[PDB]
Design a binder for this molecule. Structure first.
Ligand SMILES: O=C(O)C[C@@H]1CN(c2ncnc3[nH]ccc23)CCO1
Length: 167
């Protein structure tokens, strides 16, 4: 039993809710919140901008030190950093950004990072300003992630479309 509330069950291990991931993280304080990161960990907008703003820019400060030491992530890759006031840990995962021409096949590699964590609160990778089709993102999630994932979808209209079209 866990503290996630109000989710629709899509499969054995995938759950979905119309929610603001920032507000959901603040309420649940999950072990892991996933950030929709880029390779530079520049958290300017979308989910990343919202999560970083909620940490009062502490996420960005920590991320800048990470990059200065380690260099950029790979598209499809991830790193574990602090969750600050939102979660124990933040798993920064880089899905491909269609608006940069990155290969959508890398979306499966991106979701594979979730399998290193037993339970996660996450957004749909490569959705929103990353330019991929969220219906496709949900399908890849369900077909790739085997650990327990709680998906937060900000947009109510999109949430309803994702549920209604789910096979
Ligand atoms: O979850 C969605 O509905 C789609 C994502 C969410 N993206 C966000 N952008 C800025 N702030 C945010 N807070 C929470 C989500 C979020 C934008 C669109 O793609």
């Amino acid at each position: 039993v866990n503290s996630f509330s109000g989710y629709l069950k899509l499969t054995d291990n995938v759950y979905i809710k119309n929610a603001d991931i920032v507000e959901e993280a603040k309420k649940v304080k999950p072990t892991v919140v996933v950030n929709a990161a880029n390779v530079y960990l520049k958290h300017g907008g979308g989910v990343a901008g919202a999560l970083n703003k909620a940490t009062n820019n502490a996420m960005q400060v920590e991320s800048d030190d990470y990059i200065a030491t380690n260099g950029p992530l790979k598209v499809g890759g991830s790193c574990v950093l602090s969750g600050h006031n939102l979660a124990k840990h933040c798993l920064h995962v880089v899905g491909p950004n269609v608006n940069k021409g990155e290969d959508i096949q890398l979306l499966k590699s991106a979701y594979e990072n979730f399998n290193q964590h037993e339970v996660l609160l996450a957004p749909l990778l490569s959705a929103g300003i990353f330019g991929a089709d969220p219906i496709h993102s949900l399908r890849v999630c369900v077909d790739t992630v085997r650990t327990n994932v709680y998906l937060a979808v900000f947009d109510k209209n999109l949430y309803d479309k994702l549920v209604s079209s789910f096979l």
